Design a protein around this nucleic acid. Sequence first.
RNA 1: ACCCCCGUGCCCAUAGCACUGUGGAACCACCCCACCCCAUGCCGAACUGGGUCGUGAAACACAGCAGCGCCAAUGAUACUCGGACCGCAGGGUCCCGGAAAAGUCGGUCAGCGCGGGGGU
RNA 2: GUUUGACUGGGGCGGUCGCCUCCCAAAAUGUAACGGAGGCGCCCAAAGGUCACCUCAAGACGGUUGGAAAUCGUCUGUAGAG
RNA 3: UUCUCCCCGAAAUGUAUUGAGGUACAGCCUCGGAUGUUGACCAUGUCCUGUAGAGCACUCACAAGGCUAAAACCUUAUGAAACUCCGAAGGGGCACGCGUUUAGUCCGGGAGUGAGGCUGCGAGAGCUAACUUCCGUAGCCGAGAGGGAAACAACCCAGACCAUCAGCUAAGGUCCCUAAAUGAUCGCUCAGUGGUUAAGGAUGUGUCGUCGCAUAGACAGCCAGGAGGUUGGCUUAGAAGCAGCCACCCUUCAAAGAGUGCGUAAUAGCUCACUGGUCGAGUGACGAUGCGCCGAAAAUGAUCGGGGCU
Lengths: 175, 136, 55, 74, 104
Amino acid sequence: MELTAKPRTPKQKLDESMIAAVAYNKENNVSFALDRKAFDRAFRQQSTTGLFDITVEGGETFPALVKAVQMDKRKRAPIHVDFYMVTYGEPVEVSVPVHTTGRSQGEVQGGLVDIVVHNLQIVAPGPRRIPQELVVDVTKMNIGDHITAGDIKLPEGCTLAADPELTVVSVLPPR
Amino acid sequence: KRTKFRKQFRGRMTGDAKGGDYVAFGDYGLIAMEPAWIKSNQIEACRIVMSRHFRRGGKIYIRIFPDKPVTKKPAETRMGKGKGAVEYWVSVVKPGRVMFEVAGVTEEQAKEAFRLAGHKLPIQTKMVKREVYDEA
Amino acid sequence: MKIKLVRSVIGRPGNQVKTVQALGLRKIGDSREVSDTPAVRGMVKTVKHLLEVQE
Amino acid sequence: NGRDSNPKYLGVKKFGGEVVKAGNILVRQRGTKFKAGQGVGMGRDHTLFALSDGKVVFINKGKGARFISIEAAQ
Amino acid sequence: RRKLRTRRKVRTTTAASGRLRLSVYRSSKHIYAQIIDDSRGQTLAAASSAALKSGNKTDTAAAVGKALAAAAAEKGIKQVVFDRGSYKYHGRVKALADAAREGG
RNA sequence: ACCCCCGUGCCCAUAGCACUGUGGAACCACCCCACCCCAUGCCGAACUGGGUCGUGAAACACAGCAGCGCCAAUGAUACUCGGACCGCAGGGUCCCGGAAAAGUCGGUCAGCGCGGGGGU
RNA sequence: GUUUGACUGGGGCGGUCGCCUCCCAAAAUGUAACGGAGGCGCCCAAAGGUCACCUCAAGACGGUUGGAAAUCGUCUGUAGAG
RNA sequence: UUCUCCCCGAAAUGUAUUGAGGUACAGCCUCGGAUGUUGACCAUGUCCUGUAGAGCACUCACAAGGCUAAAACCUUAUGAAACUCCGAAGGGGCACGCGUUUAGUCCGGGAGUGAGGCUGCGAGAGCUAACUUCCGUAGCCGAGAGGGAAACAACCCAGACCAUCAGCUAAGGUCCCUAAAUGAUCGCUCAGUGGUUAAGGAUGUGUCGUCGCAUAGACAGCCAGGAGGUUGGCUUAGAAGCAGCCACCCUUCAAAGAGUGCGUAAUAGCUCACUGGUCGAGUGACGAUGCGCCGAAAAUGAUCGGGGCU
Ligand SMILES: [Mg+2]
Ligand SMILES: [Mg+2]
Ligand SMILES: [Mg+2]
Ligand SMILES: [Mg+2]
Ligand SMILES: [Mg+2]
Ligand SMILES: [Mg+2]
Ligand SMILES: [Mg+2]
Ligand SMILES: [Mg+2]
Ligand SMILES: [Mg+2]
Ligand SMILES: [Mg+2]
Ligand SMILES: [Mg+2]
Ligand SMILES: [Mg+2]
Ligand SMILES: [Mg+2]
Ligand SMILES: [Mg+2]
Ligand SMILES: [Mg+2]
Ligand SMILES: [Mg+2]
Ligand SMILES: [Mg+2]
Ligand SMILES: [Mg+2]
Ligand SMILES: [Mg+2]
Ligand SMILES: [Mg+2]
Ligand SMILES: [Mg+2]
Ligand SMILES: [Mg+2]
Ligand SMILES: [Mg+2]
Ligand SMILES: [Mg+2]
Ligand SMILES: [Mg+2]
Ligand SMILES: [Mg+2]
Ligand SMILES: [Mg+2]
Ligand SMILES: [Mg+2]
Ligand SMILES: [Mg+2]
Ligand SMILES: [Mg+2]
Ligand SMILES: [Mg+2]
Ligand SMILES: [Mg+2]
Ligand SMILES: [Mg+2]
Ligand SMILES: [Mg+2]
Ligand SMILES: [Mg+2]
Ligand SMILES: [Mg+2]
Ligand SMILES: [Mg+2]
Ligand SMILES: [Mg+2]
Ligand SMILES: [Mg+2]
Ligand SMILES: [Mg+2]
Ligand SMILES: [Mg+2]
Ligand SMILES: [Mg+2]
Ligand SMILES: [Mg+2]
Ligand SMILES: [Mg+2]
Ligand SMILES: [Mg+2]
Ligand SMILES: [Mg+2]
Ligand SMILES: [Mg+2]
Ligand SMILES: [Mg+2]
Ligand SMILES: [Mg+2]
Ligand SMILES: [Mg+2]
Ligand SMILES: [Mg+2]
Ligand SMILES: [Mg+2]
Ligand SMILES: [Mg+2]
């Protein structure tokens, strides 16, 4: 990616619709600002699990995860972003999308699957090896079953950051 | 619809909403653009329309709720005793506030269902699928 | 720090009026030379829309 | 069902960095939003008044427990 | 057992204006006593009985009061507070008092 | 001078809780006994009065630690004194200073006196 | 011979008229409405002086009458009481 | 309620009233005396506050799940004049003047006023009605002429000592009525929009994005084609792709989907999707905005003030 300025003054930012930005960790929490449309193509390509490099017009690349975007309520457009500089120990408590695989046999007799938790925040994902999704097979599930966090399988070096008993995806009956 | 609760009557003004700009439940969501009161039967008509179009299937959430009492003085009197005891319950609604959001229905059918429901709301409104989201 | 009036007192709030009166200006087109000490800077800031501050 | 109400002026009366003469009232309050400090006395209605002439000064710690006090001249 | 400590400690340092503190400690066989100048974070004239021994605790402690009365007497001690810990002005600490200011 | 204990203050959650470890014959603590000073609306449990031993069990003291509390930035935004506008209206905008709440980064399991006791 | 109130989105009927508390009240005080809610015309020789001591609601487990809540016991417990 | 010029100049608020269009006191005006910068503004220091916002830690309300003898309790998620773990901007007191200005206070004589009005902002009552009503706050009218707003207390500009057939500017303006560019540059609307609202609707037009299909030859045109199970199962008296209910599976292909629309109680019949030839270059669906269109019907004669303006 690319970004340039970071003045405390914002009057330049609004005109070219470039998003405001920051990058921080323990040592340096310096603020910045970058182009909008390329940022949105990138944030589409990767969410809170995806990461990208920023090349501030200073000559050194940095590797950033995305941590929070706070944007306009009226206009749908994103307003501000907070990238997070990350050391290659496991990134803290990253969120992972839930996604369902298979045609559940509960769907075939009047039920429908419902993902009660669209994101699951796992600790110690392991940076650069982050889970960009999380497939859960629902075919075993029948109407009224609950696939909790004590089911969802995990890759390397990962441990769920949420209570295992909590409901995740559940098949639901008609009406 | 009507709440089972507390003090009968209130007041009124406005500012852009905060308590639900993002679609947590479900897939898609219709969303308000104007600051009107919504109140009771307006919602319930939205509900009954979408439940016709979708039911036997889908999940319907109504994130808005007729909190605020509104009053009508009787008939035809002069500015008289006090305010008027009853009339209808409303929900204030500011732009970016999410009123509706379907689950388990194809994109196009959610389009048509949001269209029907929004043809009977005082405000114009825009639908969206959920972008990337945070706030947990 | 040259100044002049270029907009009337009339129909302006009270602090603006009494401040115009403090700075020494009693007619549009009056000019004056004012020191740059913090309180005078605050006065000439308080009513800066009425005044053509020179530089 | 409406006509009723009532009007009893209350508040801090002598604010910090002010020179109270002794016997001056420094706060009227209903409870103990201020607690009488060093040099201060409190009557039946939890009014705080100067015990001896001095500079009024405020000590703030946590809004459960702040105190008005007098630091005498001389 | 706690609240009585801070209770008398609040009523003592309210009544403390000019006068000095005198905090008898009694929970052990250590009936130590101190004279503390509230305000200044200082004590000046403690009379602990780790070396003294006179028999029953009520009379052992008696001499402690007497020891203390001499010490503060050398410093020019007017009066003092008293600052009981929690001990209900009983014969051993009541004796430490009668011994303190009978000989002050 | 170094160490630790007993008191006692300033500061009273960045100093509090939980899990854990270490202390006993210095100190404190439990503990023993109690007819009486003294005392429990019944009970020495607590106040209380005479003392080893025993035991650090519990407590308390100190040490580890960031699960929990508590502290809490930067970027931005909300709102807004002032200045100038739009909309029929609900309501909205612009320039100028001020500037949160929350949340993210991170920070902590304190810091500072007075005395007395006992160690080296 | 006189009396036979006033407020009052006309007057009348209704309602109100003194006092306390909260919102209105626009982070000082003050602020109107036949605006929105609620109370007083007392009480207590101890519910006061002072001096000594004790600490609450609630929940869980366990237990004679009980059987959701009585009484007793351990645990948690800035107050969720008073 | 009668003669002149000169100086200053209010009130329509508060509390009380058998009071409410009256009156007392205060407040605000004037005069004389006294002090004699104590006044005003703006700055720094200091202290006080719970509004805007925000937030659910308590009270009430409340949305989808989990656990469960439903209560509590967990994830997710909200509302608040009478909720608040928090909490500004501002506002008030005090000191100081570090800096400019010119009032202030006390004493005594004379008053009038105590029916207010509009607009912007902040609320209540009311329909988030009123040239509405009651409070707060700023300004004007009141008692303000002058310029602008066709006309017009209040809105914009600006506070009229007297004279001038001199000059500069504010709001507001420069085709003619009318002082002043029928000015210059890059655009936009062809509706008289300009010069009368909205839900809703539309290949109007100019600017930007997001998507797919493609010259190994796509979009629309045209020729040829359009499956066998199977009248798919239920369904009903009948429903055979097309009244409504369960799916949307196999054979063949360059290939025709238990399938889109019209038809007939049901059938049939005509076309749709996908496949070829011949063309032959773009084409199609979403989304943000600029200015326009429709939606747009009242009473005596019409009009943007008028002529008239692309
Ligand atoms: Mg608003
Ligand atoms: Mg706003
Ligand atoms: Mg929120
Ligand atoms: Mg103006
Ligand atoms: Mg200690
Ligand atoms: Mg332990
Ligand atoms: Mg030893
Ligand atoms: Mg014992
Ligand atoms: Mg131990
Ligand atoms: Mg910032
Ligand atoms: Mg400013
Ligand atoms: Mg403004
Ligand atoms: Mg700003
Ligand atoms: Mg914060
Ligand atoms: Mg520790
Ligand atoms: Mg020491
Ligand atoms: Mg007569
Ligand atoms: Mg009358
Ligand atoms: Mg009544
Ligand atoms: Mg107030
Ligand atoms: Mg105020
Ligand atoms: Mg008033
Ligand atoms: Mg009301
Ligand atoms: Mg004059
Ligand atoms: Mg009165
Ligand atoms: Mg009157
Ligand atoms: Mg008078
Ligand atoms: Mg005079
Ligand atoms: Mg003065
Ligand atoms: Mg002064
Ligand atoms: Mg609010
Ligand atoms: Mg916090
Ligand atoms: Mg001066
Ligand atoms: Mg007079
Ligand atoms: Mg006269
Ligand atoms: Mg009046
Ligand atoms: Mg008025
Ligand atoms: Mg109303
Ligand atoms: Mg009016
Ligand atoms: Mg008049
Ligand atoms: Mg005029
Ligand atoms: Mg005037
Ligand atoms: Mg005029
Ligand atoms: Mg004219
Ligand atoms: Mg007009
Ligand atoms: Mg008019
Ligand atoms: Mg006139
Ligand atoms: Mg000229
Ligand atoms: Mg001009
Ligand atoms: Mg001309
Ligand atoms: Mg021209
Ligand atoms: Mg429209
Ligand atoms: Mg075509």
